[PDB]
Design an enzyme around this catalytic site. Structure first.
Site, PDB file in Angstrom:
ATOM      1  N   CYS A   1      -0.918   0.003  10.974  1.00  0.00           N
ATOM      2  CA  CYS A   1      -0.869  -0.725   9.706  1.00  0.00           C
ATOM      3  C   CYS A   1      -1.794  -0.045   8.694  1.00  0.00           C
ATOM      4  O   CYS A   1      -3.008  -0.238   8.712  1.00  0.00           O
ATOM      5  CB  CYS A   1      -1.307  -2.182   9.924  1.00  0.00           C
ATOM      6  SG  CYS A   1      -1.409  -3.182   8.417  1.00  0.00           S
TER       7      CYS A   1
ATOM      8  N   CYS B   1       0.810  -1.216   0.000  1.00  0.00           N
ATOM      9  CA  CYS B   1       0.000   0.000   0.000  1.00  0.00           C
ATOM     10  C   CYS B   1       0.842   1.265   0.000  1.00  0.00           C
ATOM     11  O   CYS B   1       0.404   2.319   0.467  1.00  0.00           O
ATOM     12  CB  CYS B   1      -0.957   0.010   1.190  1.00  0.00           C
ATOM     13  SG  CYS B   1      -2.138  -1.364   1.161  1.00  0.00           S
TER      14      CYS B   1
ATOM     15  N   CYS C   1       6.289  -3.375   8.776  1.00  0.00           N
ATOM     16  CA  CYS C   1       6.994  -2.102   8.647  1.00  0.00           C
ATOM     17  C   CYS C   1       7.274  -1.397   9.970  1.00  0.00           C
ATOM     18  O   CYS C   1       6.762  -1.774  11.024  1.00  0.00           O
ATOM     19  CB  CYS C   1       6.191  -1.165   7.742  1.00  0.00           C
ATOM     20  SG  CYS C   1       4.537  -0.802   8.377  1.00  0.00           S
TER      21      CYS C   1
ATOM     22  N   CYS D   1       7.453  -5.584   5.516  1.00  0.00           N
ATOM     23  CA  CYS D   1       6.446  -6.039   6.474  1.00  0.00           C
ATOM     24  C   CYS D   1       6.954  -7.068   7.491  1.00  0.00           C
ATOM     25  O   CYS D   1       7.568  -8.066   7.120  1.00  0.00           O
ATOM     26  CB  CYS D   1       5.251  -6.623   5.713  1.00  0.00           C
ATOM     27  SG  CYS D   1       3.783  -6.910   6.743  1.00  0.00           S
TER      28      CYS D   1
HETATM   29  S1  SF4 Z   1       2.445  -3.960   8.738  1.00  0.00           S
HETATM   30 FE1  SF4 Z   1       0.697  -3.282   7.417  1.00  0.00          FE
HETATM   31  S2  SF4 Z   1       1.220  -1.181   6.661  1.00  0.00           S
HETATM   32 FE2  SF4 Z   1       3.124  -2.265   7.359  1.00  0.00          FE
HETATM   33  S3  SF4 Z   1       4.019  -3.297   5.542  1.00  0.00           S
HETATM   34 FE3  SF4 Z   1       2.751  -4.858   6.657  1.00  0.00          FE
HETATM   35  S4  SF4 Z   1       0.732  -4.647   5.588  1.00  0.00           S
HETATM   36 FE4  SF4 Z   1       1.834  -2.673   5.029  1.00  0.00          FE
END
Ligand code: SF4
Lengths: 74, 111, 110
Positions: free
Chosen positions: C78, C50, C69, C67
């Protein structure tokens, strides 16, 4: 900002990775640290980290911030 | 080749031509990727917006390998990102799946 | 797919580990997992699906968006709506997603 700058967390920033607050909400607001790096590029190549200011505190604990969440201290 | 009342998907070759012909109508571009959660969640609402605002042209661009050059130039970091254009130029922008913000930006562009 | 299965299992395990939940609409959950899998396949690391990148390889080396992240690991934020906090309006009560659901959602994109 510049690496080495002393800064204070001046915005509410709740984190869950602090070693003395593992997996528990801990607001870093009020804490003082030193800028360890400003994420802008990787060997000349621009990158997009959205919490670019990496600040180091005691115990080598580090957290990422937006420029507006921290304030320089003389 | 935009159709009033619905969302029209564009590519690296059809986008600008539509923008350079919208005239007095503001152009909204939904910059998305297929495998993005907030983008998928927003889809239904974006579809309805196109139906509610006929004086506004609604488009969408799949920021994939094919349209890599256009996405780069338009500027996108957060997926999705909505670009609002008028007079062949970007005049507004809403990053993320922020419906209210997008609405306000559209209402700002209309007025 | 092997990568997809590993990614789905990772998501289910990370959700339970961080006390976060999947979107009430599992279609949201499914597309993010596929996106993560695709990046892991082509880049070697599951870069967030995203976010748009100007230099994917550079991003993989920087790791901020790998991820989970930095925003998620540090603030439990998230953006993909994969790991939702029990306070998010779109947050459901599940931390598991059937492989069948992932398959149906991916298929609906074709
Ligand atoms: S934790 Fe959520 S916002 Fe972060 S990389 Fe993974 S899917 Fe994307």
């Amino acid at each position: 900002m510049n690496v080495g700058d002393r800064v204070r967390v001046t915005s509410s920033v709740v984190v869950y990775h602090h070693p003395e607050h593992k997996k528990t909400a801990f607001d870093l607001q009020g804490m003082e640290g030193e800028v360890a790096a400003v994420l802008t590029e990787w060997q000349g190549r621009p990158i997009s980290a959205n919490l670019p200011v990496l600040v180091k505190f005691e115990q080598r604990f580090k957290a990422h911030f937006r420029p507006d969440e921290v304030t320089l201290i003389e | 080749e935009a159709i009033v009342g619905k969302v029209t998907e564009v590519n690296k070759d059809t986008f600008w031509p539509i923008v350079k012909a919208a005239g007095d109508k503001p152009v909204v571009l939904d910059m998305f990727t297929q495998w993005c959660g907030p983008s998928k969640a927003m889809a239904p609402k974006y579809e309805k917006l196109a139906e509610e605002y006929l004086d506004v042209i609604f488009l969408k661009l799949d920021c994939n390998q094919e349209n890599k050059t256009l996405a780069k130039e338009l500027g996108i970091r957060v997926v999705p990102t909505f670009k609002i254009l008028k007079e062949n130029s970007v005049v507004g922008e809403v990053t993320g799946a922020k419906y209210d913000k997008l609405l306000e930006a559209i209402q700002a562009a209309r007025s | 797919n092997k990568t997809l299965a590993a990614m789905k299992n990772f998501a289910e395990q990370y959700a339970k580990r961080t006390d976060t939940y999947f979107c009430s609409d599992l279609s949201v959950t499914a597309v993010v997992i596929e996106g993560l899998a695709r990046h892991k396949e082509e880049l070697g690391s599951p870069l967030c699906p995203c976010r748009h990148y100007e230099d994917k390889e550079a991003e993989v080396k920087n790791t901020f968006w790998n991820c989970p992240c930095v925003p998620m690991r540090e603030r439990k934020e998230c953006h993909c709506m994969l790991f939702l906090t029990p306070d998010n309006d779109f947050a459901g009560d599940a931390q598991d997603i059937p492989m069948e659901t992932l398959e149906e959602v991916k298929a609906s994109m074709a």
